[PDB]
Short mmCIF file of C-alpha atoms in Angstrom, two decimals:
data_model
loop_
_atom_site.label_atom_id
_atom_site.label_comp_id
_atom_site.label_asym_id
_atom_site.label_seq_id
_atom_site.Cartn_x
_atom_site.Cartn_y
_atom_site.Cartn_z
CA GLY Q 13 -29.54 3.53 -4.85
CA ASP Q 14 -30.69 -0.09 -5.02
CA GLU Q 15 -28.10 -2.06 -2.97
CA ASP Q 16 -25.71 0.45 -4.62
CA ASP Q 17 -24.19 1.99 -1.51
CA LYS Q 18 -22.85 -1.08 0.29
CA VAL Q 19 -19.92 -3.49 0.51
CA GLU Q 20 -20.80 -5.38 -2.67
CA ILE Q 21 -18.42 -8.15 -3.75
CA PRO Q 22 -18.84 -7.51 -7.57
CA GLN Q 23 -18.55 -3.73 -7.08
CA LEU Q 24 -14.78 -4.29 -6.51
CA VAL Q 25 -13.87 -5.36 -10.12
CA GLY Q 26 -14.17 -1.84 -11.59
CA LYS Q 27 -11.32 0.62 -12.13
CA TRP Q 28 -10.00 2.58 -9.15
CA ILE Q 29 -7.45 5.43 -9.36
CA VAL Q 30 -5.39 5.83 -6.13
CA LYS Q 31 -5.17 9.53 -7.06
CA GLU Q 32 -7.05 10.95 -4.03
CA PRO Q 33 -5.07 12.00 -2.11
CA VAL Q 34 -2.10 11.99 -4.54
CA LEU Q 35 1.62 11.75 -3.73
CA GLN Q 36 4.61 13.84 -4.85
CA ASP Q 37 7.13 12.56 -7.48
CA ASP Q 38 3.99 12.67 -9.70
CA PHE Q 39 3.21 9.13 -8.46
CA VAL Q 40 -0.08 7.98 -9.96
CA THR Q 41 -1.71 4.54 -9.99
CA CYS Q 42 -4.88 2.69 -10.98
CA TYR Q 43 -5.81 -0.66 -9.45
CA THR Q 44 -8.01 -2.83 -11.69
CA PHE Q 45 -9.05 -6.03 -9.89
CA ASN Q 46 -10.81 -8.93 -11.69
CA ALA Q 47 -14.11 -10.47 -10.62
CA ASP Q 48 -12.48 -13.62 -9.15
CA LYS Q 49 -9.01 -14.12 -10.78
CA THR Q 50 -6.24 -11.51 -10.79
CA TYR Q 51 -5.35 -7.83 -10.24
CA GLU Q 52 -3.34 -5.09 -12.00
CA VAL Q 53 -1.50 -2.11 -10.47
CA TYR Q 54 1.23 0.31 -11.57
CA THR Q 55 3.33 2.70 -9.43
CA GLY Q 56 6.33 4.79 -10.47
CA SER Q 57 6.13 6.51 -13.81
CA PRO Q 58 9.09 8.93 -13.56
CA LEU Q 59 9.21 8.93 -17.43
CA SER Q 60 6.62 6.44 -18.87
CA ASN Q 61 4.02 3.83 -17.91
CA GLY Q 62 3.98 0.62 -20.01
CA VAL Q 63 5.18 -2.20 -17.71
CA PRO Q 64 2.18 -2.93 -15.43
CA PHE Q 65 2.24 -5.23 -12.44
CA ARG Q 66 -0.27 -8.09 -12.22
CA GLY Q 67 -0.79 -10.78 -9.56
CA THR Q 68 -3.42 -12.75 -7.64
CA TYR Q 69 -5.59 -11.62 -4.69
CA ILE Q 70 -7.15 -13.15 -1.56
CA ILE Q 71 -10.10 -11.87 0.55
CA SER Q 72 -11.88 -13.23 3.58
CA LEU Q 73 -14.92 -12.00 5.49
CA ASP Q 74 -13.52 -13.04 8.92
CA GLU Q 75 -12.31 -9.55 9.90
CA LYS Q 76 -12.94 -8.07 6.38
CA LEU Q 77 -9.26 -8.33 5.37
CA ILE Q 78 -7.72 -8.40 1.87
CA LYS Q 79 -4.12 -9.35 0.88
CA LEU Q 80 -2.63 -9.18 -2.65
CA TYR Q 81 0.11 -11.61 -3.82
CA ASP Q 82 2.80 -11.30 -6.50
CA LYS Q 83 3.60 -13.62 -9.40
CA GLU Q 84 6.01 -14.98 -6.73
CA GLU Q 85 3.06 -15.50 -4.30
CA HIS Q 86 4.95 -14.12 -1.24
CA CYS Q 87 2.36 -11.41 -0.43
CA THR Q 88 3.11 -7.69 -0.95
CA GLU Q 89 0.28 -5.56 0.49
CA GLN Q 90 -2.45 -6.11 3.11
CA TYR Q 91 -5.23 -3.62 4.02
CA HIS Q 92 -8.56 -3.37 5.84
CA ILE Q 93 -11.82 -3.06 3.96
CA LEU Q 94 -13.66 -0.17 5.64
CA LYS Q 95 -16.34 0.29 2.94
CA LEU Q 96 -17.07 -0.11 -0.78
CA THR Q 97 -19.71 1.74 -2.76
CA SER Q 98 -20.43 2.45 -6.44
CA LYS Q 99 -17.62 5.12 -6.34
CA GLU Q 100 -15.92 4.96 -2.87
CA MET Q 101 -13.38 2.40 -1.53
CA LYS Q 102 -11.51 2.90 1.73
CA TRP Q 103 -8.40 0.69 2.06
CA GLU Q 104 -7.22 1.43 5.59
CA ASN Q 105 -3.46 0.68 5.98
CA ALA Q 106 -4.27 -1.72 8.88
CA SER Q 107 -0.62 -2.95 9.17
CA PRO Q 108 1.45 0.18 10.05
CA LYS Q 109 4.44 -2.25 10.29
CA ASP Q 110 4.41 -3.64 6.72
CA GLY Q 111 4.07 -0.19 5.06
CA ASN Q 112 0.49 -0.21 3.62
CA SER Q 113 -1.20 3.06 2.39
CA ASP Q 114 -4.39 4.68 3.71
CA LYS Q 115 -5.83 6.85 0.87
CA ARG Q 116 -9.41 7.06 -0.54
CA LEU Q 117 -10.00 5.25 -3.88
CA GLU Q 118 -12.83 7.22 -5.60
CA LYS Q 119 -13.19 5.19 -8.82
CA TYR Q 120 -11.20 5.99 -11.99
CA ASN Q 121 -12.18 9.59 -12.82
CA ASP Q 122 -11.15 9.29 -16.49
#
């Protein structure tokens, strides 16, 4: 489709469920970035989900790198941008030292 299978900037700010592949312990998460402000995530839910996380984000084009920051601004995750499409996002771990997670975000399949 019309510019609709490429690394668009605004195509990030949709919903994205991490749930492909999915972990054990019934761990399930959706990232929801904002257009140019903030992010939300949630991981855990052993019994309920009602206390989200939210923080700020940073991108740069230099080596197509993206690093999210807490409400204590001390970073928390860093991963490589392989590709973005309408319904595909590939966050390569990139830093096998820090503990980042290489899955395949395939939108939020509500």
